[PDB]
Symmetry: C2
Subunit: 126 residues, 2 copies
């Protein structure tokens, strides 16, 4: 996937309403554990999910999630997440700080590892 023309746009809308959220989920058990998730998302009022359906078609990869009065586009996990984020990034501005921070995690994962997430404190506590 190659874009660049509208990649300029989506950086805008993202910097507007666009979450490059990343988090650590429990694994190997349940409480203080070890297995993460990196997620790009956009959530518009269910009033207009067609744009959210447009995001999916423009971006190709992804899905819309119906959550009541709001729905949301969720790319999901590393696979298509690296082709997208990598391409977006250069049209940075606001939220493209973590565009990189996420792109960082999406790499070399065989301890400075699973540490970037908290650093991704875009007002996320603990």
């Amino acid at each position: 996937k190659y874009n660049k023309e509208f990649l300029l746009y989506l950086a805008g809308f993202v910097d507007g309403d666009g979450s490059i959220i990343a988090q650590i989920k429990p694994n190997q058990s349940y409480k203080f554990k070890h297995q993460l998730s990196l997620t790009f998302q956009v959530t518009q009022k269910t009033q207009r999910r067609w744009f959210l359906g447009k995001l999916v078609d423009e971006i190709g990869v992804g899905y819309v999630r119906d959550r009541g009065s709001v729905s949301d586009y969720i790319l999901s996990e590393i696979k298509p997440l690296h082709n997208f984020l990598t391409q977006l990034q250069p049209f940075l501005k606001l939220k493209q700080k973590q565009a990189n921070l996420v792109l960082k995690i999406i790499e070399q994962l065989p301890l400075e590892v699973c540490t970037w997430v908290d650093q991704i404190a875009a007002l996320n506590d603990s």
Copy 2:
């Protein structure tokens, strides 16, 4: 003022967090009256108004407004409002419905006049 390169971006961020608000203010007295205002705006947490200061410098024309925990870029009135909106518009998507609707009002004003505003019901009541 001519842009087009980032005009693609600002359409994004606008479609994200960007108000092309328009309204009728009272005049010639006080209650049911006749004198309007067309306003482009962007309001980010005072956390990061530098972007709001960037909007002003990129867009040139405008001012940031400190309102407590939030601040906002307010272009203001027709003058620079027509060069901007007109240029933005073609990079439409979400909010560029009213980009036009506003551009409409910003014209021929000597009765279908001052009627577009309510039509600019982006969840604005009465």
